[model samples]
Target: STGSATTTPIDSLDDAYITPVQIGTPAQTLNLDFDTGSSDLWVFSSETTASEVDGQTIYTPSKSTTAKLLSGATWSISYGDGSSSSGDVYTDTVSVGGLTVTGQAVESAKKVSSSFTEDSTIDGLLGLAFSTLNTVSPTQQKTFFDNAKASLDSPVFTADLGYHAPGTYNFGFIDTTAYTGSITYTAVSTKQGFWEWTSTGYAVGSGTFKSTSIDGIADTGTTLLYLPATVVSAYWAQVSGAKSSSSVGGYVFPCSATLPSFTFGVGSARIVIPGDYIDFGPISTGSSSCFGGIQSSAGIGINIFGDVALKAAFVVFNGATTPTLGFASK
Candidate 1:
């Protein structure tokens, strides 16, 4: 049957184009959003009906010499952002770089909506997060790290994200050059997979910040850094001309005249967010101001150390060793 309802593709190194070696043959690749929120590596296919998806690239596995589909596994993911997708599970011989990590698990989607299947570039995502929050799992799916750990070229996987365009999140090699020195890591709390961190205090501009030892969680799923209300107010008052507005979310700012930097106290490790981001963007509420940090979304979660927190530092997820996190500069 050319097309059986139960038809599943199978293979063995038949496609030399795909290899199991690091830094293998460099090919035009897409930048998939590596989320810690879920597990499942799925890509949109060009063969997908246009009515269902737009701005997506199709991964042609048949064209690859090394592709294998896992026969009896399925996955479905419901996101916290009110989005979801599902598909069939497969173990394909895919080439990431020079390394041909065999038995690499992936999802060949039978169904993915426009929202998810709709990225300008990148075929699909390669989830590096935990399986506990997996969106796609056919038979208790393991993460890419879990599958490739045993035979990986190195002990660690490193990511090199760019400001724009396609960036590389390299696996198996930690770029020490990205950071100043060794990483100070913290253990992951069992209560929730979120990385619990300890921030000592906050500082505004050139003035001294009040010391308030606070315990919080760090999440990559979020895009903004969240702080306590009291701390937010104090920071606003400390900044020379900083003011909190009622519009555009409280954490976002609306000015740019040397907004003070707030250093997150993580014991020996500390992270600093630029004053520019702290000011957000050019103000538009009857003024020529820029945005500021410290928004007013209270009590949802203590502190969300999102992109605003990661800009200056490179954080490492130590799934290869113990469940730990390290921070550095890229």
Candidate 2:
């Protein structure tokens, strides 16, 4: 069996990518962020606090005959702060595009932080990351990909994220037509429950390709590219008016400045991000200062190859027993 879903950028700068998910018996459709950084299929549900819910859709499990509460099961993705999204678990029939999974653990939010409440565009997240990162207690749950992998034609999936345009996520198969040239394969490290790997090197605009090996995770949940200071600084320095502003709190440049495209090497293949994509629009409305799409990963602890970079390539997450990540130009 095979299934595919079309994902769309929720914002102009591709702040988040969301796809429709069918949950419960009567088929309650909710738009969920298809995140590859985390492994938790959580949702905004009737169980969530009224004060925390804005205009987002809620999955009402009580109304579905197939919904069975997973007693004693709970999950939480806590922020350092006291607030977090803690929820109860329910096993129900969930479908993504046309990929259906019976007894899929559908986490129902009981309380959420201000950030989630303020973001009305997403009803929840459909995590594609390794299930080792799942937040459930007592007994862990398998991700939709994990449970459905066995039945799929192939135990693999691919991501074709876009820039201000709709892209697609294929379950069980890769669409050769979605990209050009051959895919460059790389071994993945799952110890950290992420698609972590080392990139060959990088080049700033048309600069020389540095042969340094950079370790990072392929995170679709993140909005920007984050690398070591050396790499980020090199990219920003090439911009005419780029500066690491204290007020703006990161790298920003004049909106009218000529930004150089950033490139990263994967094995022998090179994926280039156009200069236009490096400029993440103005920091504020009608402002001359535009935020840089790439930033330092200093405080993040882990470097992230987020949407800013993934959008430039067609990524394949080969979920074989020994996982492998493949990248190809699109």
Candidate 3:
């Protein structure tokens, strides 16, 4: 069977894309961010302290007759963006699009970081990474995708992310019409519990493409593209009046600067990100300073091809015995 869902970016901060998910017997619909970087299906729930719950919606298991508490089991997760949450465990009927999975482990949040609580629109997160990366203790839990894999026609999912528009997450099958040209495939290393790949080379603007190995994760949860400091510096050098802003935490340039296009190589494939994509946006409305969509992966340790980079192409996350990634121009 096939399942599909529409994902939309939120206004103000298009950093994360979210889709609707139904949980419990009556199906409590919640807007959730489908994060491939993580592996825990946790939500803000009634278990959370009342004072900690802001304008965010909470999942109450008691309201669903199908919900069953997994006593003594709990989960906690801290994100790279500094958001954290912990909660008790429950098994409930979870559905996405037209696919249904029975008894999927649902982490009911008892505590949440201030950043998460403040974002009322995001009710929870759906982790699509490997089930091996799940946060549950004693016995690891499986993701919704994992639970439904055996029943799927094909073990695969495609992420069609858009810029200021609606995209989709198609499960068990690929929509050939969504992308143009033939898809180029590459092997993925799941050792790190991520859809990690090694980029063969990269080029700045219309300059010569440099052959350098760059290892990074294709993370939908992250907002910006992160590379080594040297690579980031090279791109900024091409932009006039670009400088590292300690206050802003990344490279910034004049709003009027003509940014150069950035391209990353995946074997014989070259995905080019237009100049307009590099200039994230003005630091503030009416300000001359602008934030960059590409930044240094220094302290973070690993490079990340986040939303900024992924938006330029159509990505396929394959779950074959030899998991692979397919990229094609949208």
Candidate 4:
């Protein structure tokens, strides 16, 4: 039997896609953000101080018969956006869909940043990246996919994301019907613990594709698309009344601006991001100004082909060998 899970967008691409995960013996369920950018499974738990816990549900380890504490072991993680969480460790039975892994590392967060505390819906994050990036102390932990790969018939998972709709994450098997056309496979360099690949070039709207090589990571946790500063400026220049805003902290354009589609070349296939996807929600309520979803990755160093770009194509995260990435149109 293969393992599979379904996730739904919390606010239709406004935030990360969340999926339900079962933990412990009685199976305490939690809504977790399956992040391909990082490698750490952490959650709000009983260990959290009363002051730090808000409207979110907490995982109580004492109530679970199979919960075991890994003494002296702890974990701390911070995201590129500056959101962070840190806590003790516990070994428990963790399940995604029907796939169960025994003695899985589950970090219980005692401290969370304001970003995570303010967002009460997402209880935690389930890292899908390489285990080498796990932040646990004493001994690093393996991801759920790594622990269960030996039992799976095929070491592969597919991400089928949708805009304003639910998406499916299939493990151990590929559902050919989930995507259209043939999947274009690209070689991935995992030296950085991310699914990193170099794009041949990209084009704004219907412009000619350039031959500039762009290195980036496929990150599902991030909500926007990040590219080189020059590329971002070029894209915004095409839109009338679009400018960098200090108040908005990114590029902002008029709500009525016409946006051109952005396309990136991956191997022989071209993955296009729709024009509307660049128009994120308004800067504020009752405001006519909107923020651009495409931004610069100057400080981050690495470009991020985030959710806005991923949702446009069907993605296959293949762990079978050499860790390649396959992409096709939805």
93-144: candidate 3 lDDT, tens digit per residue: 9988889999999999999999888887888999988888899876789998
Winner on TM-score between 3 and 4 is 4
By lDDT, the better pick of 1 and 2 is 2
Error of 4 at 210 (Å): 1.8
lDDT of 1 at 328: 68
Give the per-residue lDDT digits (tens) of candidate 4, residues 1-330.
578889888784456888899999899999899899999999999988778777887899999999999899999999999999999999999999898999999999999998888888898999999999999998999998888888887898778877778898888888888888999998899899998988878899988887788899989999999999999998999899999887778899999888999998888789999998788878888788988989989879799989988988899999976899999998
In model 2, how large is the Cα lDDT of residue 16? 83
Error of 4 at 27 (Å): 0.9
Model 4, TM vs. native: 0.97
RMSD (CA, Å), each prediction = 9.4, 1.5, 1.3, 1.2
lDDT accuracy of residue 78 in candidate 1: 63
Give each model's whole-structure lDDT.
Answer: 0.53, 0.91, 0.89, 0.89
- How many pairs collide in each candidate, listed in order? 35, 0, 0, 0
Best by lDDT: 2
In candidate 1, residue 316 scores what lDDT? 68
Model 4 Cα RMSD, 1 decimal: 1.2
- Comparing 1 and 3 on lDDT, the stronger one: 3
Give a tens-digit lDDT track for model 2, residues 143-256.
999989999999999989988899998999989999999999998999999999899999988899988889999988888899999999999989888998878878999999
TM-score of each candidate?
A: 0.72, 0.97, 0.96, 0.97
